[PDB]
C-alpha cells in the first residue's frame, strides 16, 4: 500500500479518493473510490523507501551521479524553445528545434522533428483575417438591414397617418354636419 | 437527502399515501444558506440544467435604492433590526428577503448635497474644516444659481428621513434573496410603511 503525503499517520487508513488525489486512477468521470493508503511517517515497517537526493556530496557514487542519462524528449512548444535557446522576438525558431537522429539495424538513418506548436504561420494569419472580416461584415449587413427597415417603417407609418388623417377629415365632416 | 416531495405527506382527505418510487433527484432540497453580516463569502453551487447559484454566507455591503428620488449606491450594512418571519432571525443577524436592515446614509447624503446643494443632517454647532462640503455648496455660477434654486424648492424631505440622516444610518428593506442571487439589494423605507415599521420597532423595544 503506497504512502500518501498529508495524512500524518504511521499505519493503514482507508480514504475516499477522487480525480487529482494521488494513489488513485479514476476509471470514469466523477468516480470516487475507497483506497487504503499508508501513513506519511517512516518507520521500520516498509517494503521499499523512496529517496530523492537533491544536494550532491563530495564522492562520485558509481550508481547515480557517475553517468547522466540524456533527456529522451526535446522541447516542442515554440515558446519553450525560445526560452531554451534564448531566442529573440524577431529571429526564426524553425532552424533551432532539436531533431533526434534514428539509427538501428537495417533501415537508413533518419532524423525526425516534432511539429512546432503556437507559431506565426500564414494559415493562422488567414484565419484571423477571415474572422475579423466576419466581424466587420456582420456590422455592415446589420446597418444595411436597419436602413431598409427604416425605409419600410417610414412607408408604412406615412400610409397609416394619411389614412388616419382622412378618417379625421371624415370626423370633421360629421362634426360640421 | 432533504427532498421536496408531494408524495411524502398525506392527501387532502388526510389518508396516508405509500410512496411508489424512490427519492428522485429533481425533487431536491438544500441546506439553508443562512446569510450573516461580515466579509463577503459566497459559494457557487451547481444547479439543475448546468446552471449556478450564488449562496451568500457573510455579506457586508448591498445596493439599496432611495425610491423617492431614484438614487442607489453601494452601501455597507451594519445591523438587522426587524424580521417579520421570526425573532431568531433578528437575534442572529441574517439577511433574507423582506427584512429590515440599517445602512449608513453617507452615500445618500453625498448625493443629496451634490444634487440640491442643501445641508442634510449636519446637527447645528459643527463646521467641516476640510471645506469639502463648502465647495460642494458654494461657488455656483449666476446662471446655474436659478437652476439650483428651482431644485431646492422641491428638495424638501420628510421629518423621519431627516432624523435618520442626522443619526447617520437609515432603515431599508432587502428585496433580493441573498441565497439565490448572492446580492443584498433593497430599497429605503419611506412613508406609511416606514412609520409602521418604526411602530413595530418601538413596540418591540417597549
Amino acid at each position: 500500500f503506497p504512502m500518501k503525503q498529508g495524512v500524518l499517520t504511521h499505519g493503514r487508513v482507508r480514504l475516499l479518493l477522487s480525480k487529482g488525489h494521488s494513489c488513485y486512477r479514476p476509471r470514469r468521470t466523477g468516480e470516487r473510490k475507497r483506497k487504503s493508503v499508508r501513513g506519511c511517517i517512516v518507520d521500520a515497517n516498509l517494503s521499499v523507501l523512496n529517496l530523492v537526493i537533491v544536494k550532491k556530496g563530495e564522492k562520485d557514487i558509481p550508481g547515480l551521479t557517475d553517468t547522466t542519462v540524456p533527456r529522451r524528449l526535446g522541447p516542442k512548444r515554440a515558446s519553450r524553445i525560445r526560452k531554451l535557446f534564448n531566442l529573440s522576438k524577431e529571429d526564426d525558431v524553425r532552424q533551432y528545434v532539436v531533431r533526434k537522429p534514428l539509427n538501428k539495424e537495417g533501415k537508413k538513418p533518419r532524423t525526425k522533428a516534432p511539429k512546432i506548436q503556437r507559431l506565426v504561420t500564414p494559415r493562422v494569419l488567414q484565419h484571423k483575417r477571415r474572422r475579423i472580416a466576419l466581424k466587420k461584415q456582420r456590422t455592415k449587413k446589420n446597418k444595411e438591414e436597419a436602413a431598409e427597415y427604416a425605409k419600410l417603417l417610414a412607408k408604412r407609418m406615412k400610409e397609416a397617418k394619411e389614412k388616419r388623417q382622412e378618417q379625421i377629415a371624415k370626423r370633421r365632416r360629421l362634426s360640421s354636419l | 437527502g432533504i427532498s421536496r416531495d408531494n408524495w411524502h405527506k398525506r392527501r387532502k382527505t388526510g389518508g396516508k399515501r405509500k410512496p411508489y418510487h424512490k427519492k428522485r433527484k429533481y425533487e431536491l432540497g438544500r441546506p439553508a444558506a443562512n446569510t450573516k453580516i461580515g466579509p463577503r463569502r459566497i459559494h457557487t453551487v451547481r444547479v439543475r440544467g448546468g446552471n449556478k447559484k450564488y449562496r451568500a454566507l457573510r455579506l457586508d455591503v448591498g445596493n439599496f435604492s432611495w425610491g423617492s428620488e431614484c438614487c442607489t449606491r453601494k452601501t455597507r450594512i451594519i445591523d438587522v433590526v426587524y424580521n417579520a418571519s421570526n425573532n431568531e432571525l433578528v437575534r442572529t443577524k441574517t439577511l433574507v428577503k423582506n427584512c429590515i436592515v440599517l445602512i449608513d446614509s453617507t452615500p445618500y447624503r453625498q448625493w443629496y448635497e451634490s444634487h440640491y446643494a442643501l445641508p442634510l443632517g449636519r446637527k447645528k454647532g459643527a463646521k467641516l474644516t476640510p471645506e469639502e462640503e463648502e465647495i460642494l455648496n458654494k461657488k455656483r455660477s449666476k446662471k446655474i444659481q436659478k437652476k439650483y434654486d428651482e431644485r431646492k424648492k422641491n428638495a424638501k424631505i420628510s421629518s423621519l428621513l431627516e432624523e435618520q440622516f442626522q443619526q447617520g444610518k437609515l432603515l431599508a428593506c432587502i428585496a433580493s434573496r441573498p441565497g439565490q442571487c448572492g446580492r443584498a439589494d433593497g430599497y429605503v423605507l419611506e412613508g406609511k410603511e416606514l412609520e409602521f415599521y418604526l411602530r413595530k420597532i418601538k413596540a418591540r423595544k417597549g
Binding site: A146, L152, R156 | -
Partner: protein, 262 residues
C-alpha cells in the same frame, strides 16, 4: 425514463410514414430539427422507401454523404434529417426538385416542381418577437426567425422566402377568401378557401373552410396553412387538388380508368 428517448419502434412510428410491419422492429428516429417528430418525414424514408433511389440504410448513407441531396438550398449529411411540410429537396445530379406537400390523403406525396419554382418556398409565421434593441422578429413554422419583417404581417399569416438569401419576398394575410392547406388532422390535405372564422377566447379558435366542390369542413388554427390570395395558389398543386372525394367516388373512378385502359 431517466432521460430523453433516442429510439423509435417500427410500430410506434407515425402512420403516414407508411412503414412496413414485418421488415424490422425499429423505425428510423428523426433527428431534432425545424419540424416536429410526427409532422416530419425522415430523409431515409423519402429516398429509400418512396423514391426507391436506394435499397437499405447503407445506400441511403452513401447518397446522403456524397453531397448530392440539397434541402432548403443546403446540404445535410445526416441520414435521418427531419424533412417537414413545404420543404424543398433538390437533387442536382438528376435535376429533380421535390416540394413536400400532402396529397388528398394524410401521407406525403411525390411532387416534382420546376427549378424556377424551387427557388422559393412558403412558410407560416408562428409568433412575433421584439429583440434586445427594439428589433421586430418573425418566427416561421420551420424555425426561421428572420428579423426586421414587414410590419403589416401578423401572427397567423404566411410569407414567401427565397432559399438562396433566406429573405422574404411577399406575404399573404390571414383572411377569408384565401386558399388554405390543412397540414394536420382528419382533414390532412384538404385545400379550400376560408369562409368563416369563429373566435373562442381562452381556447383555440376554429375556421370553417369551403373547398372547390362544396364539401365544407372545420379546422383549428394550428392546422391551417394558407397557400395564396384568392382562389389561386402560389405553388404548384399536386394531383387531386386537395378534395378528398368520397370512397365510392374514389372506387368507381379507378374502376372506370382500368376498364378504359384494359
Amino acid at each position: 425514463a431517466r432521460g430523453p428517448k433516442k429510439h423509435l419502434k417500427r410500430v410506434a412510428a407515425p402512420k403516414h410514414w407508411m412503414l412496413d410491419k414485418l421488415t424490422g422492429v425499429f423505425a428510423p428516429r428523426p433527428s431534432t430539427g425545424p419540424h416536429k417528430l410526427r409532422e416530419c418525414l425522415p430523409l431515409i424514408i423519402f429516398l429509400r422507401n418512396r423514391l426507391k433511389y436506394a435499397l437499405t440504410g447503407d445506400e441511403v448513407k452513401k447518397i446522403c454523404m456524397q453531397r448530392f441531396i440539397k434541402i432548403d438550398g443546403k446540404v445535410r449529411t445526416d441520414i435521418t434529417y427531419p424533412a417537414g411540410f413545404m420543404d424543398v429537396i433538390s437533387i442536382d445530379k438528376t435535376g429533380e426538385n421535390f416540394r413536400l406537400i400532402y396529397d388528398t390523403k394524410g401521407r406525403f406525396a411525390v411532387h416534382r416542381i420546376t427549378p424556377e419554382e424551387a427557388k422559393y418556398k412558403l412558410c407560416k409565421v408562428r409568433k412575433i418577437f421584439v429583440g434586445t434593441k427594439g428589433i421586430p422578429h418573425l418566427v416561421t413554422h420551420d424555425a426561421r426567425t428572420i428579423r426586421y419583417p414587414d410590419p403589416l404581417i401578423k401572427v397567423n399569416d404566411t410569407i414567401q422566402i427565397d432559399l438562396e438569401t433566406g429573405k422574404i419576398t411577399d406575404f399573404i394575410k390571414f383572411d377569408t377568401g384565401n386558399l388554405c392547406m390543412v397540414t394536420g388532422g382528419a382533414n390532412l390535405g384538404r385545400i379550400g378557401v376560408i369562409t368563416n372564422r369563429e373566435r373562442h377566447p381562452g381556447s383555440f379558435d376554429v375556421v370553417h373552410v369551403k373547398d372547390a366542390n362544396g364539401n365544407s369542413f372545420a379546422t383549428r388554427l394550428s392546422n391551417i396553412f394558407v397557400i395564396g390570395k384568392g382562389n389561386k395558389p402560389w405553388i404548384s398543386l399536386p394531383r387531386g387538388k386537395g378534395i378528398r372525394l368520397t370512397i365510392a367516388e374514389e372506387r368507381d373512378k379507378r374502376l372506370a380508368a382500368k376498364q378504359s385502359s384494359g
